[model samples]
Target chain A: HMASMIKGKLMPNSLKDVQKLICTDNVITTLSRLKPFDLAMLKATSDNKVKTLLELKPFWVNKFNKLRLEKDHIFQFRNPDPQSRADFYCGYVLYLAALKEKQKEISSYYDYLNLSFTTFNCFYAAQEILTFLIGACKNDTKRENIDLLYNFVTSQSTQIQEHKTPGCLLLANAYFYLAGFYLSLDLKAESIECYKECWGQLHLAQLLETDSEREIHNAYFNKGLATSNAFGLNSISEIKARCLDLASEALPYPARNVMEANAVKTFENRFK
Target chain B: HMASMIKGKLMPNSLKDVQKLICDEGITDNVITTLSRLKPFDLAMLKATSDNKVKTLLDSDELKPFWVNKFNKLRLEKDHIFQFRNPDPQSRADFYCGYVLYLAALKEKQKEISSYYDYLNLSFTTFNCFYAAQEILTFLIGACKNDTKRENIDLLYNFVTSQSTQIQEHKTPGCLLLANAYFYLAGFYLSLDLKAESIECYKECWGQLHLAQLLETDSEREIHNAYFNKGLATSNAFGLNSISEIKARCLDLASEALPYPARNVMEANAVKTFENRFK
Candidate 1:
């Protein structure tokens, strides 16, 4: 952590000066600090390194890998800032720098499945933080990054629903996201339940949401209500009525057309 | 055959004027250079005028088509149908030379682009204008290579990496422009075997890209999913297919007594890629 660590302690200045600096000893350091241009993102840990390009570590059932490695650093929560909370989400939640040191996060799915609800507040705290920021790919590790956030948030569906406050929009978005996640996993019954939750919070937050937001959710909610035999609104007309003109009054032409067209296609797919 | 007829004259007012210039002027050195020198708006407007102009005069004989179009044609809704591909090194080199000239000419009169954002015309709204310029500014820097003069390339670099664009980078989905700058720098350093420098830039890219995913707007979110968050693959000068090569380069660098992150970044990314296959 010394400022001029390389001053007297010699380090290679170039590829050609490699020999003088290291004398064939393959090695290196990072305090897990990632700097963007001038601003550095620091992690509360040193880095793990090796002398050679080696590590024949094999993967096994990490389902049982739930051991708290960095409880002191992780759970040592003092009053934190939004950026700090976001850094936690960015690193731990989104799984960024110096991963696996803090928790046994094998994969996003595995991380969600291996739920550590004691650290449950992180999802909520970083929720607003990241909502503004990670604003992901294939070998594309990030391919599931988006899904991870939504999945983890949805996984905490009951937690937030039970003990929530002043975040009507927050609860609405979570429910909406949760409903879509359920639909993707083909958890039809759960999707319907989550949509009912989404509709409630969404209605409460209607004054805060845009016209597009109102129209978009109403369309999706109507679809859920229409498809489910359980959501007894008593009349088919009102359910179908909720969706008509929604695509137009709020969104623009092509988007309006495409949104309706897509609604039709996905509605058909879920027909079976 | 004549530079005077068009060079000193007004820029082509219609595709018909452009057609005559190509059909009669015979794709001469001056004609192509002049065509490449058109302003960004002028160039886009040229493409906007008609499918026939882009197809016929631009020469589609040597071009091929991509199975999927690069741009979102559904969002961009013009059934102009002829999607040309520059699928070879030869064609790319030709395109690169012309692209540099185009970008250079665009900056020759500085205030034009600045004002282009203030006024909206055709497909390039202020949002699109900023994004297009951001992409162009960052892009040509990578392909600019060898500094035909450091002054020019560094100038573009300064613009892309400036705090002005930096503000917009965070405001947009996907650390948008800055991520590209870092990638370009990363690619440059990696090519030079400066593993340390390259890896750091790659870290910056990842950080920006990660934050870029979080934010507002449906279009921005689509950008979050669709655009630069994917690997940037280009050859030594400019063009490669896929990122496995660079990922392997980091591994190879680690084989030596590389730096702090050579292996950690390698393994971390490996974990991610491994997860992606099943995802």
Candidate 2:
């Protein structure tokens, strides 16, 4: 009987079946006859339908709080395991970061970086830090965050090695950011070192198959950018040759139109 | 002269360069002065903290002040820290309190703390503390040696579900976390032989999977996995040949909507399993 109730065997599946099961005199009592699971499902289904219909509803602070409260209730009920807890907490961090970005809260990304650093999910945290740093660079040329980005990545490298974590992509991305940070500061020699490190990590990451094609392509692109920056410091012929090779390597990836275009221009302007 | 020294002309470019530059006594002293004059918090301090030997770092009085100064510097440099950043000194104090609590949790000094919730709430941000709480609870659960304590389960349950709505509203990331939480609880309940509760858990999981499907239409792998799991759970809770037409339809709909390779394999297996059961 309990199995039958759990399976919703006694509940009407069709509209006509529902009418037959209910009586006019005992409609309220009859509706209460549903199993606990079935009742919950019905409520959930109705809530989903109502929310979908009210998608364009005006934003009310109280409503937001209510929604958050409901979310908390569901989260508590499900009782997430360790990994799930880590992931949910990371998601919350990202949600705050997204809102911050939306509000044009530039400095808040630093807060995001700090908060992310606290998480157990180092891979996700590193990725967010890289993204925030890159975005910050585009918006602010004074590049105050460059030092912070450099420090964070350097610290992360130490942590990853100390933990013996196989974070190929994390290390690769860190070098990529480091190279960019150094280049932005006009530190030619340091930038070159970082670029070489980036290239090495990218190669290792490719061998490990942890990095996506897009990431590998971007690595090649950054190598080109670094080489371009190093033209004045190094043998002009050697730097030109390296840039030409990297430009060719970076051409195949999608969503790299700007980098690809820059590479081609750099290759053409080599002698000039 | 200070700028030139800081620029590494008299100094080293690499560690090898450092060795070469140090050959001259005056250059070495100049480099030392430059380094000393530079920021007090450097890579060495960061390395010390990231080494993961928390107690040793704490004993050496290295972790807290460094973190506090780092937090303060980051905030001060930003010009205006957002409300969510919790720029107040109280927030900073709470963070350190939470950090110590986290260290204690890592050491399994749970009796020293009042409650996990209190420890969790001590921090403004759910970074180290939330992660530590999950780890501590997981260890505690395993230490019970399969006895399955309700309190342990409830602690995790309350923390996760309390934040479920936030996770639910977040389309991509939240969906995945919520689905995971649902499935974990479903399996946990099933293991306890709480069939009705297990079914309910499965139903909740099923709902979450559908929500994920709605939110992430372009993610083929995620959608496929969600559909496959939902179908499996549906079949388990409601028998393969159940009379509830709606339940059967839900299973069929999920199967039909499943992505290519997974759909083909799941369909073939389902038919074989159904025939085996009936025949």
Candidate 3:
């Protein structure tokens, strides 16, 4: 029912759809129906419509202050809801794409980027800032670019945590991306740990369908874990224990007995 | 003097100075007794509180707001207390007050928009920014006894002038402030008998305002025409000239801001102020 309401009514197809919603009833009342995450989800649409959504960002910013948040506000920023965090990252990722286009002609472009980064950081207290991933994904591997990407996803013990959903799958992609990015730098230990994250996140990501959406594609899944083993990291004993030792019973969370902190290992077969 | 009234009383010094001014014995001014006020985030106070940190900013942080980097921190000449450009104590106090207000207002304004690109790019100078420039100009109009105090505030004029030029060139009008900044520049040149530059400034001043379209940067704002006329009359009073007085340069300034027919009406009003006194 919630999904139907979002699709049928709230998700605007264009500027006209957005304006139509604004005019539907009391402007504040109609607009307030969407929550922060709802609005974040809304921005994943086309740029023009997302631009329209930002025109009303002031209203939504104040709206957040209107409701009560004492019980869970702290937790929201500490470790945000996975779907909402994914939605938030999607907007920043898209926003960064537009910013990068102007960087050549604009001397002030990085300052603008910092403003956007700080805004995202303060609002979400975001752990996984996708802002850093843009340059990391392309061009010569600039050091500052990958450093921010590393700090963003390397939350704790290389866990690179996310829940189980199609929404959660985006984080798996980023961890795998970070995993790949690390290997490029020849930081094999960090590379191997992220593969541990990538496989586990990728592993649970499979559950969207077969009680197993198959978190990551099987080919990349194999490629990811295989790269670590090929490096002979698995032969190091303590480091091998450190790599891909995910449990079948708990699924995504690596069994905690080995490391002092959060660790995850993925299933070889989660199809059922 | 009104300056005296404002000096200790009306104009803000610190936020505390502002608060103290409010608590002054005019609960009902000129008529009766006592009362008081409150706040914004401040840049100047932060500078005062942490001058060392600001002075030592690395090049990494100096990249934005091109003007700030262009003019580095006001150095204390030879590490002495005195310098060629230090404002008088009162002016320094008020100027500090003015700067902090800028920081406070812009911080709030920045939060209202979502696009950092558009916000930083100066696209949003529609009306409010014009009003701010005008308000500061209006204060300087009445506040200064001569150039001394006004000198302290010229930085405000410089800022407004710089921003409007950017606004004007934003593919041009929705652009009155463009003309307004040049109008002030023309005035400075005219006073110094620098006719060639004055005329140059006025030509663009009139050109821009005429083309501008604003909800209240206002319809060519008569003072603009008045200032351009000052440029015309003063430059004409002097013999120094640029072009046929109407050469390629004149046409270059001509921007079609004036409706073609209206351009011919220039001579009818004639120049009055220039002959009132000249060398």
- Number of the top-ranking candidate, with TM-score as the measure: 2
TM-score for each of the candidates: 0.23, 0.28, 0.27
lDDT of 1 by residue, B1-279 (tens): 111101111123444455446544545666566565655445444443323334344544422221122122212124254332332212322222233333333454365642222222111111223334444444356445654243443343344343222223223332445555666766566666766766666665544443333322423333432233333342112233333443345335334433456445634643442234212
> Per-residue error at A100 for model 2, in Å?
6.8
Lowest-scoring 10 consecutive residues by lDDT in candidate 1 chain B?
A: B1-10
lDDT sort, best first: 2, 1, 3
Would you list the C-alpha lDDT of every candidate in the order shown? Answer: 0.34, 0.37, 0.34
The sequence of per-residue lDDT tens digits that candidate 1 reaches over residues A213-238 is 32222222323222221233323234
Worst 10 residues of 1 chain A by lDDT: A1-10
- What does candidate 2's lDDT look like per residue over B1-279, in tens digits? 111111101111233232323322323445454433433322222222333332233223433444455434432224364222332212342333444444434343446433333333222122222334334334433433365555444443444443444233333224444444544555565567755555554454455545444445433332222222233333223433222333344446444333355434544543442234212
lDDT of 3 at A8: 11
- Evaluate candidate 2 and give its CAPRI docking class based on DockQ: incorrect
Model 3 agreement with the true structure over B153-260: per-residue lDDT tens digits? 343334433343223322122244444455555565556666665565565554443343221232223322212222222222223232134223434544443334
- Least accurate 10 contiguous residues by lDDT in model 2 chain A: A1-10
Error of 3 at B33 (Å): 36
After superposition of all CA atoms, the RMSD between model 3 and the true structure is 20.8
The docking category that best describes candidate 3 is incorrect
Off by over 4 Å in 2: A1-101, A104-113, A139-145, A158-167, A180-186, A203-272, B1-48, B51-279
